[PDB]
Design a protein around this ligand. Structure first.
Ligand SMILES: [Zn+2]
Ligand SMILES: [Zn+2]
Ligand SMILES: [Zn+2]
Ligand SMILES: [Zn+2]
Lengths: 697, 697
C-alpha cells in the first residue's frame, strides 16, 4: 500500500507489516545494519544489494547500463551481447564514477540545523549560506574517518534533518549482464508498461584495498566482504504473498501547492518532453548512419526516452484522475481548514502566501532558466563551464567552495571528464549545440541573457552558424585536454583562445549571479516551506490519511502484497507474466529479439527446476502494491522471511502520476522475479559460477 | 464447452449437463414443447422466447432492428429514441414479414428421404429434383393444417433428415425497444468485442385471430396465449455458475475439406469483406448529407458492418491458431486412417476426390458468380429479376414451382416488396449499381456474361453512365409499381419498356442456366457428401472428440459456465462488465453516447435493487464458454433451475474463427444480463407495464 516510510516510522508500521504478512520481527527490520537491511546498498540514483559473502552486488540492467555502455564498442557491444566473467579476475571496471554506498549511521541533527538557519535571522541569502556552512562542517567532521562519505537530508520541507554516513566503495566492477534483448526486452515500447517481460538484472562486485579500506580501481584491490548479504527465497512467491522493498527513492511531490502542480502539468513536463523527443530524433537519425555515435549516445538516449515517456504518462494519468481538480479541492479544503482555527493557524496561512509568490518568481524566468541550463549541459560547454568554475572555487579556502567543487568532489569531477570520452562525438554534439541555440534565439527579448547575446552576435541562422563554426575549434574534445584544464588555474582559463573556454569565461559572471538569485529564492523558501508543509501533514492526519515525507534520496521501506490491477471494467492484469509470454512477443527485430537459447528453452518447456505450479511456468515479472519511484530501480524485493524474491525495476503506465497524486487502485511496482534471474543464468546465458556463489547451483 | 447439440443427443449430454450444474432433470429438458424449452421460439435468423402468458416475446435489439427501422423516419427515429407502448393497443406492427415460430413437432424422415434420392439413379440433376419433390410433398402434407409452417433439415451432410412443424405467428408487434445508444452501445467499434457494455434487447408481442389461429396483421387480432413462458431468475448469476442456451444457430463449417477452408480464407472472406467495406463507405458518406438515406439504409449498413468485421476477425483468428495448418494435418490424418482400412475405406476416399473436384468446378467461375449475384441484389434489379422469375414460375403447377416462388412463399415476396419502401433511395441505389457495374467490368473475358456485356454495350466509364441513366428510368422505385408487377403475367413483363424489367428479361435465361449448373453440382454433392462426412464423424469418434452436426438453422442446445478468458499473457478478461464501465466509455458522440438518464442513474448509484454484491454493481454483460453462432442472437440464457439470466447476442473477437476450427480457450458467448434489461426498464427508459407483466415490477 501507500507509503515510503522512513526507518524511524517502523513503530507506526509494525502492526500493518504483520497484518500484511511479515514473519520477521519489526525489531529485526529496524536494524539498518543488520540482517537483511544491512545488505541493501545505494548506487547513487539506483539501489542494489549484496548477495554473497564475496562482494557480489545485484541490481537492474538499466542501472548497470552506464557501465556496460562505457565498456562497449561498436565492435564489441556488451549492450547487445551481454557480459560474463568466468573468474573474478575477468570482471571489468564499471567506471571511475561508479560507487557502492553501505549504510553506517543515521543521526538526527534537526535541532542544530534549524538553529544555524535561525541564527542568520531575516536575510534570505544569508539563511541559505548558513545552512550551507552548517552542512559543510557536519560532513567534514563525519568524513574525517577515511573511507566514508556523508550526506545531509532535509525531510518534510525542512521539519527534520538527518545526517547519513556511508562506507564509500569506489572500486566497482561488472561481473555479469545478460544480453540487451533480455535486460531490456521490449525496449522503449514496453517501458512503463504491463504486461512486462523484461529480465532487468545485472551483477557488480565491490572491491577495496588489502587494508580493507575503500580505494579507487587498482589490480591489487580485492573483493569486499560484506557483513550481511541476501539469500534467494526457498519458498515460491505467489499471488497475495507479502513483499517489501527497501531502497532510495529520489523525489516525490505529494506535498505541493496546487500552483506547483499546474506549472508542472501545463509547462514543465510538456516542455521537457518536447525537447527530449527532438534530441532523440536527431540522435536516432545520426546513429542509424554511424554505429560509433549509436553506441556512444545510447545511455543518453535511454534517459531521454525514459523521462519523456514518464512525463507523457504523468500527463495522461492527471487527466484520468483529474489531478488538476483534486489539487484545487484539497487546497481549498486545506485553506478553509486553516483560518478555520484563527490564531493558531495564521503562521501556516502566511507561508502559503509567501510560497505561492516565490513560485510566480521562478515562473517569470523559467524558459530562460531551462534553456540556458540545457544549452550549458551540451558536452563541450558543460565541460568548460564546470572546469572554469572549479578554477574559481579552488582560489577559496575549501570550506567556502561551492558544493560540487570542494576537495571531496574532485574524484567525481575528474571521473566525469574521462567517462565523457565514451559519450561524446563532435559531429553529434554540434547538432545539439545547434538545437539549443535555435531554441535560445526563439526566446523573447525580456527572457534573454545579455552575455550570451553578445557572445553570439545577433539573432539569426547566420550567427548560429558562426557560433557553431567557432566552437568547433575547441580542443576540449579529447580526454587529455579536459584533464589539463582540470588542473589549470584561473588565469590560464582567462588567457585561453580555446572558444569553448572563452564561452565559459564570457558567461560565468551571469551564472554566478543567477546562482545567487537561486540561493536567495531558496532561502525565503527555507522559512515558509516547513511551516506550511507541517500543516499539510497535520490536516492529513486529521483526515486519517497516511503521513510520510516525500522522497529525498534517503532510505525508505515500502510493503504490501503481490497483486495485479484493473485498468478498465471487464478486465484485469494478472500478477505474473510467464516464459510463454516472452516468446509470444517475439518478432526477430529489436526490441523483441530474444536470444535463440531462450526461444528454444521455452518451446521445450525447459523450466530448470524453477516452474511455479500455480502459474504452470517460470515467472518472469510481477506486480505488487508497493510504493516506489525513480531511485528504487535495483532495490531487492523481500518476502515474509526476508528472502530475495525479485528486483524492483519499473512502474505500470497508470502509476506514474502518483508522484503528485497517489492512486492506490492503479499504482503498482513491476519487479523481475528472482526465479527468472536464475532461469536466465541457468538456461540462456549461463553463469554457473555466480549461481554456486549464491548457493543456488 | 464445445457442442451445438441436437435435442436427440440429450442422452449423451445428460451427464455433462449435471456435472456442469444443471438442477433440472434431463427429461424435463427433453420435452421440447414443455417447460422451459417450449418457451424458446425461432424468428427466422434470430431466436427469441416467451416471457409472459400474454404473448410477450424478448429478443435482441439487433434482431428487432429491422422492425424498429421499418417504423422509423428521419423525423421520428425510433432507432435513436427507443419505443415504448404503454398499453398493448399502442404496439406497432413489426412489418408484414415478421414471424414467431413455435415448435410443434419434430419427425425423423431420414429413411424416406434417402429412398427418394436413391430412386433417382445415376444422374446428378435428377437426384436434386427428386430430393426437391420429396421435400415439397412432405412440406405440403405437413402444412395442410392451417397456421403451420414446416421445414426440412439435412444434418451431417445428408446422413440424417428431420422435419420440423411450427405454429407460424404472422402478426408480430413491437412492444419496446431501448434507445439505440443502449441497444447498440459501442456500435461497430465494440461489435465482436469484449469488454462489452451493450443493452442488446427488445420486446415483441405475438398476436393471433380471435378464433386462436394465426393471421396477418389486423386490429381484430388479440395476444397469443403461449403454453409456456420463461421466468426471470430469483438467484443472482455469478462467476462459475451453470448456464445453457437453446436456439437456432444458422451455419458452421467444422466438417469441411481443407480446400473448402483454403478457398474461404484466401478468396471468399477477403473478397466479400472488401465489397462490403466499399459499399459501407459510399452509403456512410451519402447518409452524412441526407438523413433519409441514413435512416433508410441503417439496417443494410448494420449487416455489411457486422459481416465484414466478422470476416476480418475469422482471418485474424485463423492466423492465431494456424487454422490452415490444422486443416491440412487433420485431412492428412483422416485420409491416412482411411487408406489404412483397405477396401472398406475406399468409398470415403473416392467421396473425398469427388468433393474436391466439385469445389474446383465452383472455383472456376467464382468471381463471375459472386459479382453477378450481388449486382442483381441491388434494389431495382433484385426486384425486377425476382418478380420476372415469379411470373415464369406461376405458369407451372404449384408442386413444380421453384422453392421460394410457390404459393406458400407469396406472402414473404409481397411483404418484401412493401418493406423495401423504407429501405430504398434512388440516388443511393444508383451508386451501388455503379459500384457493381465497375466491378463487373474488371472481370476477365472468360468470367463475363454475354447478356450483361450486350446490355452494357461498352466497357468504359461512359457505357456505365449510359446504363445507369437508362436504369434510372425504372418505375419500380414505388411500392405500388412493384405490387402491380407482383400480380402481372409473364407476357406483360416481356412487353414492358421498364428498363429494370428489360434488364431482368435480358439476363433471365443466363440466371436459369447458372441455377441448373448449381443444381447439377448439388446433385453430385448429394452422392459424395454423406459418405465423406460420415467418415469424418467416425474418425473424430476414434480420436474421442465431440461429435455433433454443423449448424443448419435447427434447434440446438449448448451449456457450460460463466467464465472469462485470457487473451494474452499477463491479462485476463473478467466474466462481467458493470454499469460504471458503460459510463467510463462515454464520449457524448455516437456510438458512445448513452441516454442522459443512464449517466445520471449510475452517477447516483441507483442500482434499483439489482446490485450483485460480488461485483459491486449491476452487471451489464457477461462471458461464458457456450458454443453459439449467427442465428443464436436473442436466445435465452437459462440458469441451473431453467430461469432466465440473460440473452445471447455476440461472441468475442477471438471466437469467430470457431466457425471453421473450434478453439476452446478463446471461444466465449457474450450475453446481456437479465438484470441489466430490468435495470434499464426501471431507471433509464422505463416500462413498468412490462416489468409488471413479467412480475418483476
Ligand atoms: Zn513462514
Ligand atoms: Zn593542450
Ligand atoms: Zn404502372
Ligand atoms: Zn438450487
Amino acid at each position: 500500500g501507500e507509503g515510503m516510510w522512513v526507518p524511524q516510522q517502523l513503530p507506526e508500521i509494525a502492526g500493518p507489516l504483520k497484518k500484511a504478512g511479515l514473519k520477521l520481527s519489526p525489531q529485526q527490520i529496524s536494524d539498518l545494519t543488520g540482517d537483511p537491511m544491512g545488505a541493501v546498498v545505494a548506487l547513487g540514483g539506483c539501489t542494489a544489494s549484496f548477495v554473497s559473502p564475496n562482494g557480489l552486488v545485484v541490481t537492474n540492467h538499466h542501472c548497470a547500463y552506464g557501465a556496460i555502455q562505457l565498456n562497449s564498442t561498436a565492435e564489441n557491444n556488451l549492450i547487445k551481447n551481454g557480459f560474463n566473467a568466468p573468474t573474478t579476475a575477468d570482471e571489468v571496471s564499471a567506471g571511475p564514477n561508479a560507487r557502492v554506498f553501505v549504510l553506517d549511521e543515521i543521526t538526527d541533527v534537526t535541532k542544530d540545523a534549524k538553529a544555524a538557519i535561525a541564527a542568520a535571522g531575516d536575510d534570505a541569502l544569508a539563511r541559505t549560506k548558513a545552512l550551507e556552512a552548517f552542512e559543510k562542517k557536519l560532513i567534514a567532521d563525519c568524513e574525517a574517518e577515511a573511507g566514508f562519505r556523508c550526506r545531509l537530508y532535509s525531510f518534510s520541507g525542512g521539519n527534520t534533518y538527518r545526517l547519513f554516513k556511508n562506507l564509500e566503495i569506489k572500486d566497482v566492477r561488472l561481473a555479469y549482464a545478460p544480453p540487451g534483448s533480455v535486460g531490456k526486452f521490449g525496449g522503449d515500447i514496453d517501458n512503463w508498461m504491463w504486461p512486462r517481460h523484461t529480465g532487468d538484472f545485472a551483477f557488480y562486485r565491490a572491491y577495496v584495498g588489502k587494508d580493507g579500506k575503500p580505494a579507487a580501481f587498482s589490480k591489487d584491490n580485492v573483493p569486499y566482504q560484506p557483513k550481511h548479504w541476501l539469500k534467494f527465497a526457498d519458498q515460491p512467491l505467489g499471488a497475495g504473498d507479502f513483499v517489501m522493498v527497501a531502497g532510495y527513492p529520489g523525489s516525490t511531490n505529494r506535498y505541493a501547492l496546487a500552483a506547483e502542480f499546474d506549472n508542472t502539468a501545463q509547462w514543465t513536463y510538456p516542455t521537457i518532453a518536447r525537447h527530449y523527443k527532438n534530441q532523440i530524433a536527431m540522435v536516432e537519425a545520426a546513429g542509424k548512419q554511424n554505429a560509433d555515435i549509436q553506441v556512444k549516445y545510447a545511455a543518453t538516449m535511454a534517459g531521454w526516452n525514459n523521462t519523456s515517456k514518464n512525463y507523457d504518462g504523468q500527463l495522461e494519468g492527471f487527466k484520468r484522475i483529474d489531478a488538476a481538480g483534486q489539487k484545487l479541492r484539497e487546497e481549498a479544503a486545506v485553506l478553509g481548514w486553516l483560518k478555520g482555527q484563527g490564531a493558531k493557524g495564521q503562521p501556516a496561512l502566511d507561508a502559503h502566501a509567501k510560497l505561492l509568490d516565490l513560485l510566480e518568481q521562478s515562473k517569470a524566468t523559467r524558459d530562460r532558466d531551462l534553456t540556458l541550463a540545457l544549452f550549458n549541459n551540451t558536452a563541450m560547454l558543460g565541460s568548460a563551464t564546470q572546469l572554469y568554475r572549479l578554477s574559481i572555487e579552488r582560489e577559496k579556502p575549501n570550506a567556502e567552495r561551492e558544493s560540487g567543487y570542494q576537495e571531496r568532489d574532485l574524484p567525481a569531477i575528474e571521473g566525469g571528464l574521462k567517462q565523457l570520452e565514451r559519450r561524446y562525438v563532435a559531429a553529434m554534439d554540434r547538432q545539439l549545440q545547434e538545437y539549443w541555440l535555435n531554441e535560445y534565439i526563439k526566446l523573447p527579448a525580456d527572457q534573454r541573457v545579455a552575455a550570451v547575446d553578445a557572445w553570439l552576435g545577433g539573432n539569426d541562422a547566420a550567427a548560429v552558424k558562426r557560433a557553431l563554426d567557432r566552437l568547433a575549434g575547441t580542443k576540449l574534445g579529447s580526454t587529455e585536454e579536459r584533464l589539463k584544464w582540470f588542473a589549470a588555474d584561473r588565469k590560464a582559463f582567462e588567457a585561453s583562445n580555446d572558444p569553448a573556454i572563452q564561452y565559459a569565461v564570457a558567461v560565468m559572471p551571469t551564472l554566478l549571479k543567477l546562482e545567487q538569485e537561486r540561493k536567495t529564492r531558496a532561502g525565503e523558501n527555507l522559512a515558509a516551506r516547513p511551516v506550511y508543509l507541517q500543516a499539510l501533514a497535520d490536516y492529513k492526519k486529521s483526515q486519517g490519511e497516511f503521513v510520510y515525507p516525500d522522497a529525498n534520496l534517503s532510505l525508505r521501506i515500502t510493503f504490501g502484497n503481490v497483486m495485479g490491477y484493473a485498468p478498465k471494467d471487464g478486465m484485469e492484469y494478472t500478477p505474473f507474466t510467464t516464459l510463454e509470454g516472452v516468446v509470444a512477443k517475439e518478432t526477430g527485430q529489436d526490441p523483441f529479439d530474444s536470444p535463440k537459447a531462450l526461444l528454444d528453452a521455452v518451446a521445450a518447456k525447459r523450466y530448470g527446476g524453477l516452474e511455479d505450479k500455480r502459474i504452470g511456468s517460470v515467472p518472469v515479472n510481477y506486480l505488487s502494491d508497493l510504493d516506489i519511484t525513480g531511485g528504487n530501480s535495483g532495490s531487492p524485493v523481500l518476502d515474509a522471511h526476508g528472502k530475495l524474491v525479485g528486483l524492483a525495476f519499473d512502474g505500470n503506465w497508470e502509476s506514474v502520476s502518483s508522484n503528485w497524486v497517489f492512486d492506490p487502485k492503479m499504482t503498482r511496482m513491476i519487479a523481475v522475479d528472482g526465479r527468472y534471474l536464475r532461469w536466465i543464468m541457468q538456461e540462456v546465458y549461463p553463469a554457473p559460477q555466480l549461481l554456486k556463489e549464491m548457493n543456488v547451483g
